[PDB]
Write a protein that binds this DNA or RNA. Structure first.
Lengths: 366, 366
DNA sequence: TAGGGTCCT
DNA sequence: AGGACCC
DNA sequence: TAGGGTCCT
DNA sequence: AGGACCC
């Protein structure tokens, strides 16, 4: 029943991809911006004081030289993101993506095949690769320690390969479920890896400073938990099941409470090809509601070649908006047109009618 | 690109199944009732004046003797319904169910395989089986006439088989798409079949007296079409695309207008096993909101053995209600419990809280 | 936030 | 269609 | 309606 | 979760 999961987390992904593109930014502190924000930056930059999501001022002006590169167009990041997942799929087919820069891989079957291959004696020579969370001592007679170490060796091989084959660095964490792998992958932040032995599972989970830090608990649940006095992970562990059950629902409640103990039985799901392709433009009020339809052909133009590219074709289109909350108009894509721009353009137009930012989404792929 | 579709429609299905069960009702006019209604009845009954969905009074008292059998419990109907579909699947794998007593089968591939088998001469001997809609003349040199006739021969074989193997009678209609097959299957109502040649497609579609009669157009669309002056099928054929587009949406609009011409490109979809299992009880106000939870264990008890039976197990439960409009509380089914009553019972209870008729639905099968 | 994406209700 | 969660 | 069911938004 | 459509 016990698993060996790895979580692979790429350092400052977009900046890595931009530094690979213009090398002259290698030494230089680098910010990737979209609109007014520095959504990410390389280490130099971060060191000289910057954070994911500061103002191109509160941050340019917080610092020198700061090179800015525009990262509005996600295309290259999205391609590199899939190169990484495909590489990890080669290790073990079941890989789950979480945004463009994180992947979970279930290493359970692969660890077991390795251990079977190892003869009677070299098993005592199995070592760790990377850090051991909390500096915990290994016990070579613990079968679970031996699996998690083999799991740290797969992880180092994945990271070596992502570096040798794609030029990317990244962190990894090995643990017995997704929550823990993800919590432990960032303990040694830059381009390193860590492995979580079971005896340190409470230490990790209690190293959190707020339940918002638990993946699975977002902006809302957190605000609600607060309203009940629950603030630390230990308040959530000890809070009353009932009262919680009867406030967040049995589902929400009885899952987030297991999380608070480090227990998480959710499988790593095979993500495979994406379920949708969309594009977007912000513009703090810039749609006169009228003129701004040209932005609509915009988005289509890019999308169409993406949607094409795939093979698979979309059976639904959808349009989305915001106001000086979002709204969406869903609709089937007419038969024969799947098989160019011009028809589409006008399906999207009336959709527009039936209704600070705009988007087209192509979904329901077949 | 042209298809041969059959639509198979069983006569007064529940009554057939009840007449097979108690033979003494064979000669006798038979009503199947659920609560206060005669949801269906055998021909004798219908003849001596009865209709699908009259009051057990406005109808018992509209007529003699009238035997009543309770059809609240759908179990036997549901089993016989699947026996019928499985039989038709044996002819050609792609069969779509529409409620418990109707099935569409795409006979395209099977008709073509038959025609290929027929040598050069016997092709002139191909005949029809059953009625030809509108008494239309056949043209043996029309490839489309020849396909639809072979299609009427498959249809007679299906009906013979449903009769010989399962004791059920029924109607069939063969046509080039689902709309037309379904419109034409009831032209000779009792236990007969009809085939639609293309030249009579407008005659059939114009034989309708209201656009509500077009499968695809329901209670709402109809009321809306009316609000625009559209009443006959010919008003809908001739109504303006735009105005219609810009009232029902492009999707709704441009599909129902094709229907009004007898054009319908929707594929017969393989229904396979069901996507959900649910049970229900009416009771014009009888839930004190409190006591009535016993009805909840009720429904579960039956369901559980159904859900079991299948193989596949449900990952979601859901509860539904009405008021002296419906409401549903959706929720995941806790891991380990999939693998009895007692846990469930209480998951359903709190669901109850977060909130003339009651139901449990098990869905999201895996 | 930005510019994506995913699953549930 | 909209809500919630993730990066 | 009753007692089911299915797909879309 | 609720709307619309079918039997």
């Amino acid at each position: 029943s016990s698993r060996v999961i790895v979580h692979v987390d790429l350092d400052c992904f977009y900046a890595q991809v931009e530094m690979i593109s213009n090398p002259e930014l290698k030494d230089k502190p680098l910010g990737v911006q979209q609109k007014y924000l520095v959504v990410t930056c390389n280490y130099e930059a971060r060191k000289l004081g910057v954070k994911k999501l500061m103002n191109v001022r509160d941050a340019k002006e917080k610092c020198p030289q700061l090179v800015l590169v525009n990262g509005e167009d996600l295309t290259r990041y999205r391609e590199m993101s899939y190169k990484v997942t495909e590489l990890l799929e080669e290790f073990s087919p079941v890989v789950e993506r979480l945004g463009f820069d994180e992947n979970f891989v279930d290493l359970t079957e692969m660890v077991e095949k390795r251990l079977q291959q190892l003869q009677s004696d070299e098993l005592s020579a199995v070592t760790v690769s990377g850090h051991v969370y909390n500096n915990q001592s290994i016990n070579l007679l613990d079968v679970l320690h031996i699996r998690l170490l083999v799991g740290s060796q797969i992880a180092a091989e994945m990271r070596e390969a992502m570096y040798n084959q794609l030029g990317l660095t990244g962190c990894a964490g090995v643990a017995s479920n997704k929550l823990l792998a993800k919590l432990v992958s960032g303990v040694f932040k830059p381009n390193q890896q860590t492995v979580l032995l079971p005896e340190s599972c409470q230490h990790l989970i209690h190293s959190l400073n707020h339940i918002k830090e638990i993946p699975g608990i977002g902006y809302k649940t957190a605000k609600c938990l607060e309203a009940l006095g629950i603030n630390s992970v230990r308040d959530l562990q000890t809070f009353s099941p009932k009262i919680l059950e009867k406030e967040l629902g049995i589902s929400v409640a009885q899952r987030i409470q297991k999380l608070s103990f480090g227990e998480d039985n959710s499988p790593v799901i095979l993500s495979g090809p994406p379920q949708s392709f969309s594009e977007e433009d912000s513009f703090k009020k810039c749609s006169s509601e009228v003129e701004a339809k040209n932005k609509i052909e915009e988005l289509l133009a890019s999308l169409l070649n993406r949607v094409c590219q795939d093979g698979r074709k979309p059976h639904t289109v959808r349009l989305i908006i915001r106001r000086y909350g979002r709204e969406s108009r869903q609709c089937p894509i007419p038969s024969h047109v799947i098989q160019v721009m011009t028809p589409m353009v006008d399906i999207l137009m009336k959709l527009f009618r039936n209704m600070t930012l705009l988007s087209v989404c192509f979904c329901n792929l077949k």
